[PDB]
């Protein structure tokens, strides 16, 4: 692909693997599940599912049925023993094909028990369900009281008839990156009376998890048997109250660079980009990044984005446009062609992704999952 | 059935009457115009291939992407498009594939020697000629030439170019930084540098078959910028480009696209109960709440987090707390809608839902963005194909 010359996401498995490891040390008590859904946060499912589990991942997450049933199809074949779970599941999905596929299936309620259990039967082999709890977060899980006992009662039926058998019990929490935050013991008290309850009435699942990144970074009482690592997998903080990746171990595995598509001289008192939000001051040299908010670069990044161009950071001048966005270069004369650095690692003197979160006013996570299919991912140290 | 199975949890529909309707009405309003299907950025998300034979049904008779790759995949979709419709594209790099793009008849556009020097160094490699645009930066400060000393250099190698007989000429354009805001002073301005800019060219030597400058809101408000060719890219989709401008409804046309998504719980939870990450939203008493299985990575802004709007069970619902990844909640205030019950995030808004510019104002955004930015993930379905 010649597309890379416009642009290119490039993802460094060798940071991934490092990450993992990483990560790994910081749990010494628990297996790791490495968390590719959403095309792996951006950077690729079945790459960083193969690198994650080469340095010691024992679990992958994902959240629909059809991304862990895109990885177990994968060829040639992650090796045949790595567990597979996904979570997000509407009535009438491929629950069939999920437990031919062995995968560990998320059910967080009875209509979803009666759908696996069905298709556990029509199949002839047992699944594998995690029962998710709602300790706090209000998300996705099975509340406290009449509806957990209900719903522990059905998988006990199951597993009494060979249909299934309980592999997990897990939640997740609300506010894990924001250190002594009440919620937070709050829901691993709950998390613990929840499942204390589920195994006195005789469930044996063989993990219990609850971490995501920050709490596995912070919170060693929450690791259990299982930790779920995402963005802290790339390399990423989950914030920066929690802290840096250096303050980790971490190396960002995602570097975003463009080659400038024109540079050229303007007067003072010229208007760039849509609605003129930028005007030059006098007379300077303007520079093109061909990459847009169609491509990820998130609209709300416009006259804050920063960018390492020709020596220095530069930011965005005026609106980020669909498919591009200027610098105004102060008079800098780099060529056409010349690299334009949004962010990675930061160790050459570019921005991170955090930088991008803090122009944008949103998060990490966001920018580093919505780059866009338009821009081609290169693969290093696979 | 795998295809059946991914728009279960959510879909993007895609209504391809309602975007030639809107062709019909573009052409309309522009009848002096040659219409360009801008279907860069895989049509603002609503599928290029598809779009453009659409677009090109009823009345296109020019495509316009910004990549080169987009406009090759134009060329090479199966069955082909009509061998006869322009394609032009725009966004170019040192070292892309001008040669490629020249054996395969593509209009490229031109702001810079450099890239003069490309596709002339192109062209004589290929044998055959190129059809070049010349873009001129009338004002918008992006990805055009400029005025006066640029310009005339510009010009000078094209002409040369065309007397060795490696090119054409083809088209002089340019693209309007305000035209949204009617009335804006830089309208007018950069149009007479476009008049001035192209006469320019054309006493040089210069014999363009189009000069156009019009965007969407050009071409709806802007009779005089129409010249030989319009470019309402928003419009086709039947989006407005501002309120500013007006509704769809003010200018015949209709949202192409509506994005919904089936629930994937419904359950009761006590008052006093945080909802979603850092808890932003609590509810204030015992009540019901809906899991709508679309998130940030499918293209759902974070910035609609506290504001998105969606339809479920006969009412407007609005996003409760943070929207995650995969995932926002939604307080149904008691309903029990059953599981897999339609959630209607926008569309046309004729039942009831939301419209794209509503979540562009809940997002602090445009609907440009909305609806380009949806993610890989929801599959696209394509209706009145
Ligand atoms: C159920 C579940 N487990 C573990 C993780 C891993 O989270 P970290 O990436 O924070 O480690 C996530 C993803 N969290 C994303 C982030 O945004 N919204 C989500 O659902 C998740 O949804
Ligand atoms: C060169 C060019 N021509 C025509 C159009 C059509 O614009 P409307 O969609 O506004 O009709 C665009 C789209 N402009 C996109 C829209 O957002 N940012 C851009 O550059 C464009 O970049
Ligand atoms: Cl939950
Ligand atoms: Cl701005
Ligand atoms: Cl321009
Ligand atoms: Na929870
Ligand atoms: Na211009």
Not at 248 to 275: E, I
Not at 319 to 327: E, G, H, L, S, T
Request: hydrophobic share 45%.
């Amino acid at each position: 692909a010649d597309a890379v010359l416009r642009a290119r996401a490039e993802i460094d498995l060798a940071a991934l693997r490092a990450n993992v490891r990483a990560l790994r040390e910081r749990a010494p008590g628990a297996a790791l599940m490495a968390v590719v859904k959403a095309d792996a946060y951006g950077h690729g499912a079945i790459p960083c599912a193969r690198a994650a589990v080469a340095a010691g991942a024992t679990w992958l997450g994902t959240a629909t049925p059809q991304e862990a049933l895109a990885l177990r199809a994968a060829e040639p074949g992650l090796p045949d023993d790595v567990r597979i779970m996904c979570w997000l599941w509407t009535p009438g999905g491929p629950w069939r094909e999920a437990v031919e596929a062995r995968l560990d299936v998320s059910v967080s309620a009875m209509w979803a028990m009666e759908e696996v259990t069905g298709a556990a039967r029509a199949a002839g082999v047992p699944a594998r369900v995690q029962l998710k709890a709602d300790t706090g977060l209000g998300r996705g899980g099975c509340q406290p009281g009449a509806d957990w006992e209900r719903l522990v009662g059905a998988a006990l039926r199951a597993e009494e008839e060979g249909l299934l058998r309980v592999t997990g019990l897990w939640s997740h929490f609300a506010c894990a990156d924001e250190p002594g935050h009440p919620s937070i013991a709050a829901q691993l008290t709950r998390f613990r009376e929840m499942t204390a309850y589920a195994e006195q009435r005789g469930l044996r699942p063989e993990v219990r998890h609850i971490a995501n990144s920050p709490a596995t970074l912070t919170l060693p009482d929450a690791h259990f048997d299982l930790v779920r690592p995402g963005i802290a997998m790339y390399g990423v903080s989950p914030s920066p109250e929690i802290g840096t990746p250096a303050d980790f171990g971490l190396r960002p595995v995602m570097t975003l660079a463009a080659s400038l598509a024109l540079v050229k001289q303007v007067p003072g008192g010229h208007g760039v980009s849509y609605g003129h939000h930028y005007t030059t001051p006098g007379e300077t040299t303007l520079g093109l990044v061909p990459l847009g908010y169609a491509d990820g670069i998130p609209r709300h990044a416009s006259s804050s984005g920063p960018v390492l161009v020709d020596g220095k950071w530069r930011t965005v001048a005026g609106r980020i446009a669909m498919d591009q966005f200027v610098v105004d270069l102060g008079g800098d004369r780099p060529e056409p062609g010349a690299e334009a650095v949004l962010f990675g690692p930061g160790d050459r003197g570019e921005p991170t992704a955090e930088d991008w979160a803090q122009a944008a006013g949103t998060i990490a996570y966001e920018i580093v999952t919505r780059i866009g299919s338009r821009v081609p991912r290169v693969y290093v140290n696979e």
